[PDB]
Amino acid sequence: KGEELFTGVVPILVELDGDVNGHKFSVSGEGEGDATYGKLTLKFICTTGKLPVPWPTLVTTLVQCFSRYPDHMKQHDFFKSAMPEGYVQEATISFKDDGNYKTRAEVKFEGDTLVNRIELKGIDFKEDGNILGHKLEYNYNSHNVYITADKQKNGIKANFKIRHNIEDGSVQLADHYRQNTPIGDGPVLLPDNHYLSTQSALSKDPNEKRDHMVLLEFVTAAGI
Ligand SMILES: [Mg+2]
Ligand SMILES: [Mg+2]
């Protein structure tokens, strides 16, 4: 049972290689998750210099196995069930009136550590749009991630809309379409329709000179 791997505090590593409109960059993250409380705490560093996109646009790419699934919903937790072999998470993020990100990640244990390894590719972004023009506020709204099964692929799909606040009071929509597929051959849990209720707080480390993001996140399964 992968769920048994999450009863306590688990170290997390995140590594992302990105290319947006030919701007190349990498991000490294470290922290821990405590699924019992649906809680994530991570610090992300742009190891290549200045991040060429706003940090908030990377939040959904940068480990939903740390969601809190209520006891009565535990037979719907696909993410922990795929562990430790892990799962592939792929997404298309469409920024309304702008470019798109396509991502591919593997989330699995490396020893006792939960690792999220990501490749991100962004194209067709506007030079002085909200993303490349860095016009997005350093904050983050609360969302519901709607999950449905894809029995065909032995996995799940997610559909949701991220709303990014813009510095002028407007909103930049990011439509998300994602698929998750197990890496191993063992049985996984295919859930009834439900959603993950997420809340995210972004901050800075006062002693840190590199381009970075400190994130505190709470995720709870619901709708069943
Ligand atoms: Mg490193
Ligand atoms: Mg505002």
Curated annotation (Swiss-Prot):
Changing A201V: In EBFP1.2; shifts the excitation and emission spectra to shorter wavelengths and increases quantum yields compared to BFP. It comes from the Eukaryota. Changing Y37N: In EBFP1.2; shifts the excitation and emission spectra to shorter wavelengths and increases quantum yields compared to BFP. GO terms for biological process: bioluminescence; generation of precursor metabolites and energy. Changing Q64L: In RSGFP4; increases fluorescence and shifts the major exitation peak to 489-490 nm. Changing I123V: In EBFP2.0; shifts the excitation and emission spectra to shorter wavelengths and increases quantum yields compared to BFP. Changing N141I: In ECFP; leads to cyan fluorescence, folds faster and more efficiently at 37 degrees Celsius and has superior solubility and brightness. Gene3D superfamilies: Green fluorescent protein. Changing Q64M: In Citrinine; leads to excitation and emission peaks of 516 and 529 nm, respectively. Changing H143D: In Cerulean; leads to improved quantum yield, a higher extinction coefficient and is 2.5-fold brighter than ECFP. Belongs to the GFP family. This is Green fluorescent protein. It comes from Aequorea victoria (Water jellyfish).
